[PDB]
Scaffold this motif. Structure first.
Motif, PDB file in Angstrom:
ATOM      1  N   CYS A   1      20.539  80.471  60.299  1.00 17.55           N
ATOM      2  CA  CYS A   1      20.752  81.911  60.198  1.00 17.55           C
ATOM      3  C   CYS A   1      21.064  82.314  58.761  1.00 17.55           C
ATOM      4  CB  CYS A   1      21.892  82.345  61.121  1.00 17.55           C
ATOM      5  SG  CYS A   1      21.579  82.036  62.874  1.00 17.55           S
ATOM      6  N   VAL A   2      20.628  83.512  58.380  1.00 14.73           N
ATOM      7  CA  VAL A   2      20.859  84.016  57.032  1.00 14.73           C
ATOM      8  C   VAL A   2      20.865  85.541  57.009  1.00 14.73           C
ATOM      9  CG1 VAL A   2      18.397  83.850  56.546  1.00 14.73           C
ATOM     10  CG2 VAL A   2      20.028  84.073  54.659  1.00 14.73           C
ATOM     11  N   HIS A   3      21.812  86.113  56.273  1.00 15.00           N
ATOM     12  CA  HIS A   3      21.925  87.563  56.166  1.00 15.00           C
ATOM     13  C   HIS A   3      21.552  88.036  54.764  1.00 15.00           C
ATOM     14  CE1 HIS A   3      24.732  91.116  55.226  1.00 15.00           C
ATOM     15  NE2 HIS A   3      23.647  91.603  55.800  1.00 15.00           N
ATOM     16  N   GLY A   4      20.786  89.120  54.694  1.00 12.38           N
ATOM     17  CA  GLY A   4      20.371  89.654  53.410  1.00 12.38           C
ATOM     18  C   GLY A   4      20.549  91.156  53.322  1.00 12.38           C
ATOM     19  N   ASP A   5      21.377  91.598  52.382  1.00 14.29           N
ATOM     20  CA  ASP A   5      21.633  93.022  52.196  1.00 14.29           C
ATOM     21  C   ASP A   5      20.918  93.546  50.955  1.00 14.29           C
ATOM     22  OD1 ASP A   5      23.250  95.365  53.222  1.00 14.29           O
ATOM     23  OD2 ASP A   5      23.973  95.300  51.147  1.00 14.29           O
ATOM     24  N   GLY A   6      21.259  92.982  49.799  1.00 16.52           N
ATOM     25  CA  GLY A   6      20.641  93.406  48.557  1.00 16.52           C
ATOM     26  C   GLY A   6      20.495  92.270  47.565  1.00 16.52           C
TER      27      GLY A   6
ATOM     28  N   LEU B   1      24.238  88.149  50.281  1.00 16.53           N
ATOM     29  CA  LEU B   1      23.518  87.119  51.021  1.00 16.53           C
ATOM     30  C   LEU B   1      24.475  86.049  51.537  1.00 16.53           C
ATOM     31  CD1 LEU B   1      20.154  86.890  51.050  1.00 16.53           C
ATOM     32  CD2 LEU B   1      20.733  84.651  50.098  1.00 16.53           C
ATOM     33  N   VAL B   2      24.171  85.506  52.711  1.00 14.97           N
ATOM     34  CA  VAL B   2      25.003  84.470  53.313  1.00 14.97           C
ATOM     35  C   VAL B   2      24.181  83.568  54.227  1.00 14.97           C
ATOM     36  CG1 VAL B   2      26.937  83.993  54.849  1.00 14.97           C
ATOM     37  CG2 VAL B   2      27.082  85.881  53.210  1.00 14.97           C
ATOM     38  N   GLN B   3      24.236  82.265  53.967  1.00 16.14           N
ATOM     39  CA  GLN B   3      23.496  81.297  54.767  1.00 16.14           C
ATOM     40  C   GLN B   3      24.437  80.492  55.657  1.00 16.14           C
ATOM     41  OE1 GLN B   3      21.500  79.085  51.670  1.00 16.14           O
ATOM     42  NE2 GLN B   3      20.850  81.017  50.730  1.00 16.14           N
ATOM     43  N   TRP B   4      24.060  80.333  56.921  1.00 13.42           N
ATOM     44  CA  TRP B   4      24.872  79.586  57.873  1.00 13.42           C
ATOM     45  C   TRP B   4      24.020  79.069  59.026  1.00 13.42           C
ATOM     46  CZ3 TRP B   4      24.202  84.761  58.138  1.00 13.42           C
ATOM     47  CH2 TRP B   4      23.923  85.314  59.395  1.00 13.42           C
ATOM     48  N   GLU B   5      24.321  77.857  59.482  1.00 13.04           N
ATOM     49  CA  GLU B   5      23.580  77.249  60.581  1.00 13.04           C
ATOM     50  C   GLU B   5      24.332  77.410  61.900  1.00 13.04           C
ATOM     51  OE1 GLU B   5      22.339  73.225  59.963  1.00 13.04           O
ATOM     52  OE2 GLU B   5      21.343  73.687  58.059  1.00 13.04           O
ATOM     53  N   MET B   6      23.593  77.706  62.964  1.00 12.87           N
ATOM     54  CA  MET B   6      24.190  77.885  64.282  1.00 12.87           C
ATOM     55  C   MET B   6      23.661  76.846  65.265  1.00 12.87           C
ATOM     56  SD  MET B   6      24.510  81.994  64.917  1.00 12.87           S
ATOM     57  CE  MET B   6      24.927  81.872  66.655  1.00 12.87           C
ATOM     58  N   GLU B   7      24.516  75.897  65.633  1.00 13.36           N
ATOM     59  CA  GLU B   7      24.133  74.844  66.566  1.00 13.36           C
ATOM     60  C   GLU B   7      24.682  75.128  67.962  1.00 13.36           C
ATOM     61  OE1 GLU B   7      25.539  72.051  68.334  1.00 13.36           O
ATOM     62  OE2 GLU B   7      23.461  71.586  68.882  1.00 13.36           O
TER      63      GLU B   7
ATOM     64  N   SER C   1      33.023  83.891  51.696  1.00 14.32           N
ATOM     65  CA  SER C   1      33.789  83.896  52.937  1.00 14.32           C
ATOM     66  C   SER C   1      33.843  85.298  53.536  1.00 14.32           C
ATOM     67  CB  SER C   1      35.207  83.380  52.690  1.00 14.32           C
ATOM     68  OG  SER C   1      35.638  83.684  51.374  1.00 14.32           O
ATOM     69  N   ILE C   2      34.348  86.248  52.756  1.00 11.28           N
ATOM     70  CA  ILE C   2      34.455  87.630  53.207  1.00 11.28           C
ATOM     71  C   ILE C   2      33.249  88.028  54.051  1.00 11.28           C
ATOM     72  CG2 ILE C   2      34.265  90.023  52.463  1.00 11.28           C
ATOM     73  CD1 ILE C   2      37.088  88.756  52.419  1.00 11.28           C
ATOM     74  N   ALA C   3      32.088  88.118  53.410  1.00  9.89           N
ATOM     75  CA  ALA C   3      30.859  88.485  54.101  1.00  9.89           C
ATOM     76  C   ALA C   3      30.562  87.519  55.244  1.00  9.89           C
ATOM     77  CB  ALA C   3      29.694  88.523  53.124  1.00  9.89           C
ATOM     78  N   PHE C   4      30.859  86.243  55.025  1.00 11.68           N
ATOM     79  CA  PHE C   4      30.623  85.219  56.036  1.00 11.68           C
ATOM     80  C   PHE C   4      31.355  85.555  57.332  1.00 11.68           C
ATOM     81  CE2 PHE C   4      31.769  81.112  58.039  1.00 11.68           C
ATOM     82  CZ  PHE C   4      30.492  80.685  58.346  1.00 11.68           C
ATOM     83  N   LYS C   5      32.566  86.085  57.200  1.00 14.06           N
ATOM     84  CA  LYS C   5      33.372  86.452  58.359  1.00 14.06           C
ATOM     85  C   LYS C   5      32.992  87.839  58.867  1.00 14.06           C
ATOM     86  CE  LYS C   5      36.559  84.820  55.651  1.00 14.06           C
ATOM     87  NZ  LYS C   5      37.781  84.277  54.996  1.00 14.06           N
TER      88      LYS C   5
END
Length: 126
Positions: free
Chosen positions: A67-72, A77-83, A104-108
């Motif tokens: 999973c990965v989030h992209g705003d600008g 941006l934040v990359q994280w794996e979901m198992e 972290s901030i965005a990650f949470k």
């Protein structure tokens, strides 16, 4: 071995406990609970959330999605794996959130949302 036939088995139980008494470690990993059927649905559902939040994902393993989030930009941006996995102790598909890169901030802030959509527990920092 390909699933050509469809299958929709939804279950509804009214047996649970409403209490805020959990013991979370200090490690850098978030936990959540709220399965939508089988270990499979998890992938489908979860992914649904991403697409909704302009988020992309890269399937790596049968039960692993990058999973990965992209705003600008990276900052956002934040990359994280979901198992997806289940244990006899909790007896509930435990979705762990691993922060590969970003902040972290965005990650949470984002980890809390995904849960809402997936009617997941939705733990917070108190």
């Amino acid at each position: 071995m390909k699933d050509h036939l469809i299958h929709n088995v939804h279950k509804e139980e009214h047996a649970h406990a409403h209490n805020k008494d959990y013991d979370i470690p200090t490690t850098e990993n978030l936990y959540f609970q709220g399965s939508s059927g089988s270990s499979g649905d998890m992938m489908r559902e979860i992914r649904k959330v991403l697409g909704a939040n302009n988020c992309d994902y890269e399937q790596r393993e049968r039960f692993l999605l990058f999973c990965v989030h992209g705003d600008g930009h990276a900052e956002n941006l934040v990359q994280w794996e979901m198992e997806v996995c289940k244990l006899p102790r909790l007896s509930l598909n435990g979705v762990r959130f691993k922060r590969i890169s970003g902040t972290s901030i965005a990650f949470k802030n984002i980890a809390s949302k995904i849960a809402n959509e997936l009617k997941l527990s939705g733990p917070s920092s108190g």
